Structures are given as C-alpha cells and as structure tokens.
Amino acid sequence: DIQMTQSPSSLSASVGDRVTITCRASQSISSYLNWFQHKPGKAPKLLIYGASSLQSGVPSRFSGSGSGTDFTLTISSLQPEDFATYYCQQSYSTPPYTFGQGTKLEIK
Amino acid sequence: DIQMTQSPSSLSASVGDRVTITCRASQSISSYLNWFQHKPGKAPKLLIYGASSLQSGVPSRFSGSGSGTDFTLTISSLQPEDFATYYCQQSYSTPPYTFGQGTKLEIK
Amino acid sequence: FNCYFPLRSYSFRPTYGVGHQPYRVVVLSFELLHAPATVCGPKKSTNLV
Amino acid sequence: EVQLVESGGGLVQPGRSLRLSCAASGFTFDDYAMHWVRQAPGKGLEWVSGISWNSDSIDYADSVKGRFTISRDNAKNSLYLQMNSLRAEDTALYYCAKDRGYEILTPASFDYWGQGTLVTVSS
Amino acid sequence: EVQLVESGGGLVQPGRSLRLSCAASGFTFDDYAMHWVRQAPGKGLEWVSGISWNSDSIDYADSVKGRFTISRDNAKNSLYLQMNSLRAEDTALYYCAKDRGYEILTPASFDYWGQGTLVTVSS
C-alpha cells in the first residue's frame, strides 16, 4: 500500500508573503504526484500534474518540486484569491489514485 | 519521525581480532549516516562521514559499508588504543541530527 | 504578469531527485600564446646539451 | 472551458438504488477516460471508480466493489453511475472528473473537473 | 588541529539563568557553522542547537524550544549560548562542535569537536 502525510494543516500569511506546503509518501513513487486546488464553493481544479510540470492556464506563481518520497509546492506571491484546500495525489502505487488529507490555507 | 537502534551494546575481543557494529534505522535515510567515536577521557571525534567516505587524518582500519536502511562499521586491526564508544547519527530526517545509543567496545 | 523577475531561488533538499541534487561545476579555460607560458606542469628540468 | 453537468442526486433510504448521469460538451469524448470521485462532507477527496475511453478496462474502489456499476454512452457524450445497496456512509459529494489519457490506471491524472452533486442516504 | 575552548559551567539552582562561551582559533570562523550538543551523564549524546556561518538560519531542539538562545560574534571568532529557566535534567555535559558545512540543516555533520564543560542544576 501507500500512505501520504501532510506535515502542515493550516497556514497563515499575508498578501505579500511566500508559503510552502509539503507532502510525504510512505515509499518512493518516482515523482508521480499531482497537486490539486479545491475552492470550497466551486469544483476543485488541478494545479500541478507530474512532479514539476505546470498545467496550462494557471499563473506561474505556483511551483512544484521534489522527487522520491517527499514533494513540495510553493507560492511566491499569494494573490488574494489563493484561498482553497490543497491536495497531493499519487498515481504510481497499486492503490489507485489515493489522495492525501486536506491542507487549509488562510491569509492574515 | 526517525527511530534507530544499536544491535550490539558491549563486545569483547582481543588485540588481533576483527569486529563489526551495525546501526539499524526505522526508515531509509539515503545512506546519510555518520559514525562517531567518543573516548571516555576526551571529546568525541568523527571517523566516517556519509555512506562509505573515510574522513582524512584517521587510520584506514575503520571501514564503513551499507546504504539505504541499515549500515555497518568494521574494524580489522583492533589497536590497543580503540577503547571508546561508537555512535551512529542520521542527518536526513526532520528530527535534526538524531544520535543513537552507545556501543561499548572492549577487549579481554 | 507581463513583468517577471528572472531571478529565482533553488529548492535544494537532502532528498530531492538524483538529477535534482545540486552539483558544483568549474570550467577551466586555457589559452596558449607566444608569450612565455606561466602555468606549467610538474615535469622537472634537466641540463641542456 | 469544458462542461461537466451531473444529475441524479437526491435523498434515498438505505438499501435503495439511485442513478447518476454526467454529460460533457467541451471536448472530444470518444478518446478520453473518465472517473468518479468522492468528497466527504468533513473529509478530503477520495477516488471511487473509473472507465476508459471504451468499455474495456474498468476499475472500482475496494470499499465499493460489487455494489456500484459505471456505464458510458459515447453517442450522446455522457457517462453514468448506478449506485446500489447504499449505506449511511455514502452521503458525500460526488465529482465527475475526466482523465488526461485514455487508459484507467496510468500516471496521468484528472485534468478537468465538474461541480459535484450532493446525495444523501438516510430516512 | 583547531582549538575549541568552552566556559560558563558551574553549579546553579533550578530556575535561574547562566551563559556559556565557546571560542575557536584554529581555522576561519566567518564561514563555518557551529552547534551545541549535550552528553547526558549516563545516556548517549543529544543535539541542542546550531547556528550557521551568518545569523540568518537558527534552530533549537524540541525539548528546549523557547528556552535557550544562541549568539555568534565573528569579530572575535566566538559563539555564546544562554541557559534560561533550567530544571533538573540540564546537569549534563555540553560540547561545542563545528559543522563541516555552512548551513544549519545539511547532511554534512560535525567535523571537529571540543572538550565539554560541566554544568550542575541543583540546590
């Protein structure tokens, strides 16, 4: 099997800060992780497919990195519409498309 | 979190024997472990840094081996000046620089 | 938007990808001219005959 | 700009069956795989099931094996999910996402999503 | 061959504050990272704190968060460590080790060490 852990759960920052979120895997998944943004009021949207491949149409502010067992997403600008819940999903292990727990983001 | 154990605690040998010590880790640390020797009468010193890199200035008798999860240190000559305690330290996981239990070495 | 800063910060971590790991690179450029060479090798010198 | 409209949600008693439809209009459908995923009212997202571009490779979640059945009609550009033998722990919000590739179990993930439909299994 | 001299030890009562100094002279101090570590009298050694070459990245052990503070003066090639709100288990030996690297959290470990100084927290 596989287990994904979110070291941070709720993070506070300002409109002019830079934030980082980490997702850890039980074992190596060979950089096969995806990052999803879920607004509480609308349908969730994908931010990153693959380890560090940016999906088209989204701002370049988001940046993904990491390989092996741990992975990281970083926002450099924190625009005031970046309030959502962020998920990390693996697509390499036998359990198909298992998702990690949510990661609340708030600005203060 | 990381948890690591010293399988041998106290060992007995002679002046012309060969001895081995093993360090066991809960999770793989990508061979980022270091070996320290602590004399009872003076400050401890480093011998093996990294997986199997020998720190310059110490005799080549000490030999490091093993990568990934479990690691091993080996002494082939057992000089009469080798009365000290051996420690294994990880520098990989989020607990910053965890240090293992003591491993008493003596000859009779 | 329309104006990005070229400067970016690496995110090197102890357990990133093998390729993701940072490597130190030094390039040595050698130029040979008619001027007396000042960077010679370890070869010794003898007496001319 | 793609559209994913879902219907069939509502409230039913435990042990009954209900029917969901999800129609897409913003992209070519004959060569894309689709998935159904679940979001608990107080927990994160969870995958439920998935079908390929054609009904050859089909996958269900372990906790829902032998109970739910997924179908796909390419002619009218839609897929369907029949829920059978519902229990009190299936009152979550279900999303109808589309895979980037064509197969079911691939490193490629869900590209576009649609607003979830709310179902309730209670009296 | 480097020198690491430490001071500030002694006997104190629980709840008061004191200070320890560590000076190095055998190498260049402006670009190296230092650490303070603890050897228990009857248990193995444990890490306490560390500072980088410059006072930008700082850290502390989990058991001593918000209790101890470290400082570093590159002008006189020395560092300082302040004991605040001590209790019964802080009567152990303290070393002043030198990191092989320059950051605080790197796989590079301690390269040279120095003689520990003894402290006592009792009445």
From Swiss-Prot, chain C:
It comes from Severe acute respiratory syndrome coronavirus 2 (2019-nCoV). Residues 34-49 are annotated as: Disordered. This is Spike protein S1. Attaches the virion to the cell membrane by interacting with host receptor, initiating the infection. The major receptor is host ACE2. When S2/S2' has been cleaved, binding to the receptor triggers direct fusion at the cell membrane. When S2/S2' has not been cleaved, binding to the receptor results in internalization of the virus by endocytosis using host TFRC and GRM2 and leading to fusion of the virion membrane with the host endosomal membrane. Alternatively, may use NRP1/NRP2 and integrin as entry receptors. The chain holds residues 486 to 534 of 1273 of the full protein. Binds to host ACE2. RBD also interacts with the N-linked glycan on 'Asn-90' of ACE2. Cleavage of S generates a polybasic C-terminal sequence on S1 that binds to host Neuropilin-1 (NRP1) and Neuropilin-2 (NRP2) receptors. Interacts with host integrin alpha-5/beta-1 (ITGA5:ITGB1) and with ACE2 in complex with integrin alpha-5/beta-1 (ITGA5:ITGB1). May interact via cytoplasmic c-terminus with M protein. May interact (via N-terminus) with host bilirubin and biliverdin, thereby preventing antibody binding to the SARS-CoV-2 spike NTD via an allosteric mechanism. Changing residue 5 to L: Increased resistance to neutralizing antibodies and human covalescent sera neutralization.
